[model samples]
Target: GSQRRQRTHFTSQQLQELEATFQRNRYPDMSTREEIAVWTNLTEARVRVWFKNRRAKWRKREEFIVTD
Candidate 1:
């Protein structure tokens, strides 16, 4: 099986928007994703999957956190 992949480049504003939303809610509802996608002009599906990847990245970047 083979498939083509789109470019994986995110502009500063795009990531900024995504970062802001992630800080607020990691698991936002469909409407929430819809709204964010509209404002950022990025597909909700794309942003959503990247979040799954981000968690893996976050795990590697900051493996441990002490909760109070």
Candidate 2:
């Protein structure tokens, strides 16, 4: 049986801070993830996955914008 994990929702403050940090630095190192995880009350893995997904999505959007 295959089951997909339910999507996690972040608070507005968390998303605002995360976006701020993302714009500052797209690739956050372990120290950055650790700090964000602690500050946001999220796991390091969650922060990492968020950054990874954000990076991929940002790149895709940039590519489309450039092509247009």
lDDT scores in order: 0.73, 0.76
Give Cα distance to truth, residue 36, candidate 2, Å.
1.4
Off by over 4 Å in 1: 1-9, 61-68
- How far off is residue 14 in model 1, in Å? 0.6
lDDT of each residue in 1-68, candidate 2, tens digit only = 79956456677777777888887887878998899888888778888877877777766845552111
Among all windows of ten consecutive residues in candidate 2, which has the lowest summed lDDT? 59-68
lDDT of 2 at 6: 49
Candidate 2 clashes: the total is 0
Q: Estimate each model's TM-score.
A: 0.66, 0.67
**Model 1 lDDT per residue over 1-68, tens place:** 69865455567778777878888998789889888887887777877775776677667756543121
